[PDB]
Amino acid sequence: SSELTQDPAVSVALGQTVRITCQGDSLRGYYASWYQQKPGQAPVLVIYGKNNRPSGIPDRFSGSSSGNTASLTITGAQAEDEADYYCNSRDSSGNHPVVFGGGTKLTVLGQPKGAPSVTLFPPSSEELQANKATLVCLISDFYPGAVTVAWKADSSPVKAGVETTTPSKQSNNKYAASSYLSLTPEQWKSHRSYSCQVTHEGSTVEKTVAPT
Amino acid sequence: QVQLQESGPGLVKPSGTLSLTCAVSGGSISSSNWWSWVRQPPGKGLEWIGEISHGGYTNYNPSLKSRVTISVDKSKNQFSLKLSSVTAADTAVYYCARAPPYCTSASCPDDYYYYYMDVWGKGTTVTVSGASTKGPSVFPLAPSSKSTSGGTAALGCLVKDYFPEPVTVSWNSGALTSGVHTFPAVLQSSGLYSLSSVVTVPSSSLGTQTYICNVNHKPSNTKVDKRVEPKSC
């Protein structure tokens, strides 16, 4: 296609080599640049002028091009190379506006799986005295990035007042999520306990807190 | 050594005008450089907005040209972006950036003045919405025996019921970075956000150190510094 295109996703095994390719008419006679972006972070230039690495970029990144395609190669991929990679050009038309590829999300396979670390906080004294009550269930360091969360009041299920996030990618490529249970102060103070139950790949971690 | 920092309003009303500034440090706006803007809608890719040189010359994305003005302020060493008639499609993180002098047209005398953006700001989050801004209510998440496991204790801060995004959290005015985990916000049924930030610390440091979370909600011009102390009582 004439437009600047790259596959939306590709995977590579730890320590293997992967080539990310961009294709478009604007690459003809053009020295492309490439940008790495991780969730929650600004883009970082990794290749410019077809094949030049900025200072600080490791030598396992390289670039090449011919005709209407340009490629970013990662040789000996490491876990920290998991990111979205965008190619960049300027169109030959008009006054040459800047165009980005759609980005290729690179998954690095073989990273360690992990059960979630779960911390459950009770309502603070300050919040209770403000006539509100929130339990905070923080869930981190799990891989793969899928989880389900359930809450208990004493031994019974409670679903009113529950709000739970989608999992988010941490800097170590594991995932995080949080779940909040809203209660009244009188409900909190009159129960024996409340529990957060986190299920991840068939196993469950439950934490319990009690008023005191 | 050029570094860039965006500032923005957080919320812009629909059909209103977005105004952003980028503060340049470690270099002069008057140097040969293309001071640039890029944006990224939530969950989507990068879109270049435009560029300006110190002399006033501009180039804009043709799909945005009719609504964009980029300007430069020599004396304050800043450049800026105005985007008029905004809609929900303009909700995005906006980045300022620097591109060195370039020449990519076939008519260029030289070929080695490549185009690229090597320096990027942190980004500022712009939400186009008719709803009202609401500052957060911050509560401590005290360390206790039940939030401690062996030699490591968790403590944190709960940031409740704010709009729009984002909130940033630091600890001890930035002097505490190890073990800090600020979680992505939940979007509640009310349309308000809440998030938590937790730090893991040695359990033997709980009596000897002071822990303060610094919550910044720039959209509502609110900052809260919340002391987090062990439970006791």
Q: What angle do CA B57, B63, B66 make, to 5 degrees?
A: 60
User: Resolution in angstroms, to 1 decimal, for this deposition?
Assistant: 1.6
Which amino acid is present at B197?
A: S
**How far, in Å, CA of B49 to CA of A103, rounded?**
17
Q: What are phi and psi of B229, to 5 degrees?
A: -115, 155
Q: Is A187 helix (H, G, I), strand (E, B) or coil?
A: helix
Last residue of a domain, which of B130, B151, B171? B130
Last residue of a domain, which of B130, B146, B176? B130
- Domain holding B184, by residue range, is 131-233
Which residues in B lie closer than 8 A to residue A52 (C-beta atoms)? 114
Q: Contact at 8 Å (CB) between B85 and B13?
A: no
CATH of the domain at A59: 2.60.40.10
Using CB atoms, pick whichever of A48, A98, A125 lies closest to residue B114.
Answer: A48
Considering the domain architecture, whether residues B123 and B155 belong to the same structural domain is answered as no
| B139/A52 touch (CB, cutoff 8 Å), yes or no | no
**How far, in Å, CA of B25 to CA of B100, rounded?**
16
Q: How many domains does chain B have?
A: 2
Q: Contact at 8 Å (CB) between B102 and B35?
A: no
Q: Quickly tell me which residue has 């185009």 as its tokens.
A: B115
**Total residue length of chain A:** 212
Considering the domain architecture, whether residues A89 and A121 belong to the same structural domain is answered as no
Measure in Å the smallest separation between the Cα of B39 and chain A Cα atoms: 10
Measure in Å the smallest separation between the Cα of A14 and chain B Cα atoms: 26
From the list A4, A95, A99, A89, the residue with the least C-alpha distance to A48 is A89
Which residues in A lie closer than 8 A to residue B184 (C-beta atoms)? 40, 165, 168, 176, 178
**How far, in Å, CA of B62 to CA of B58, rounded?**
12
Q: What are phi and psi of A2, to 5 degrees?
A: -65, -35
Provide the strand spans (E) within chain A.
9-13, 18-23, 33-37, 44-47, 61-66, 69-74, 83-90, 98-100, 104-109, 117-121, 133-142, 148-153, 156-158, 162-164, 168-169, 175-183, 194-200, 203-209
Q: Contact at 8 Å (CB) between A118 and B136?
A: no
| A124/B158 touch (CB, cutoff 8 Å), yes or no | yes
| A102/B194 touch (CB, cutoff 8 Å), yes or no | no
Last residue of a domain, which of B130, B148, B182? B130
Which residues in B lie closer than 8 A to residue A124 (C-beta atoms)? 139-142, 158
C-alpha Rg value of chain B to the nearest Å: 22
From the list B28, B143, B17, B7, the residue with the least C-alpha distance to B87 is B17
Considering the domain architecture, whether residues B124 and B141 belong to the same structural domain is answered as no
Provide the strand spans (E) within B26-163.
34-40, 47-52, 58-60, 68-73, 78-83, 92-99, 119-120, 124-128, 137-141, 148-149, 152-162
Distances (CA, A) of A22 to A57, A70, A99, A132: 20, 5, 12, 53
Q: Is B84 helix (H, G, I), strand (E, B) or coil?
A: coil
Measure in Å the smallest separation between the Cα of A92 and chain B Cα atoms: 7
DSSP string, A63-104: EEEETTEEEEEESS--GGG-EEEEEEEE-SSTT--EEE---E
Q: Is B44 on the interface with A (CB under 8 A)?
A: no
Considering the domain architecture, whether residues B110 and B171 belong to the same structural domain is answered as no
Q: What are phi and psi of A189, to 5 degrees?
A: -70, -20
Measure in Å the smallest separation between the Cα of B36 and chain A Cα atoms: 11
Which residues touch B42 (CB under 8 Å, ≥6 apart)? B91, B92, B93
Considering the domain architecture, whether residues B137 and B223 belong to the same structural domain is answered as yes
**How far, in Å, CA of B91 to CA of A155, rounded?**
44
Last residue of a domain, which of A77, A109, A141? A109
- Domain holding A85, by residue range, is 5-109
Write down the experimental method used for this entry.
Answer: X-ray
**How far, in Å, CA of B233 to CA of B230, rounded?**
9
For the record, the structure tokens of B119 come out as 């320096």
Considering the domain architecture, whether residues A26 and A100 belong to the same structural domain is answered as yes
Q: What are phi and psi of B12, to 5 degrees?
A: -125, 135
